[PDB]
């Protein structure tokens, strides 16, 4: 399938134990995709002061369309020193590894895989 229905745990930035996916744009996009597939990916909602508490490169999920079965269609865009790799809509949040942190909510997305 080109798209996969996922329910992503929404984590508070100060709870997150592993604050990024790795060290290159290519690695973080790779790792993000692997964690999304394995159900080990959390979502942090971006507000004032959130991104400086996470590790670059960042992986965003961005709205790709204006929502089958409640699932917002999204795609992955990476960022490193203010340059983005990808072009998409509005940010739903930043992806991070999930290692058992307690979520505050779940974000239903349809991920272009």
Swiss-Prot record:
Inhibits host translation by associating with the open head conformation of the 40S subunit. The C-terminus binds to and obstructs ribosomal mRNA entry tunnel. Thereby inhibits antiviral response triggered by innate immunity or interferons. The nsp1-40S ribosome complex further induces an endonucleolytic cleavage near the 5'UTR of host mRNAs, targeting them for degradation. This inhibits the integrated stress response (ISR) in the infected cell by preventing EIF2S1/eIF2-alpha phosphorylation upstream of stress granule formation and depletes host G3BP1. Residues 2-113 form the CoV Nsp1 globular domain. Residues 1-113 are annotated as: Disordered. Changing residue 37 to R: In strain: Omicron/XBB.1.5, Omicron/EG.5.1. This is Host translation inhibitor nsp1. The lineage of its organism: Viruses, Riboviria, Orthornavirae, Pisuviricota, Pisoniviricetes. It comes from the Viruses. It is found in: Host cytoplasm.
């Amino acid at each position: 399938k080109t798209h996969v229905q996922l329910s992503l745990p929404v984590l508070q930035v100060r709870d997150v134990l592993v604050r990024g996916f790795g060290d290159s744009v290519e690695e973080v996009l790779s790792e993000a995709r692997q964690h999304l597939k394995d159900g080990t990916c959390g979502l942090v909602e971006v507000e004032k002061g959130v991104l400086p508490q996470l590790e670059q490169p960042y992986v965003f999920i961005k709205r790709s369309d204006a929502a089958p079965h409640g699932h917002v269609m999204v795609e992955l865009v990476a960022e490193l020193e203010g340059i983005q790799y990808g072009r998409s809509g509005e940010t739903l949040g930043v992806l991070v590894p999930h290692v058992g942190e307690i979520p505050v909510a779940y974000r239903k997305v349809l991920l272009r895989k």
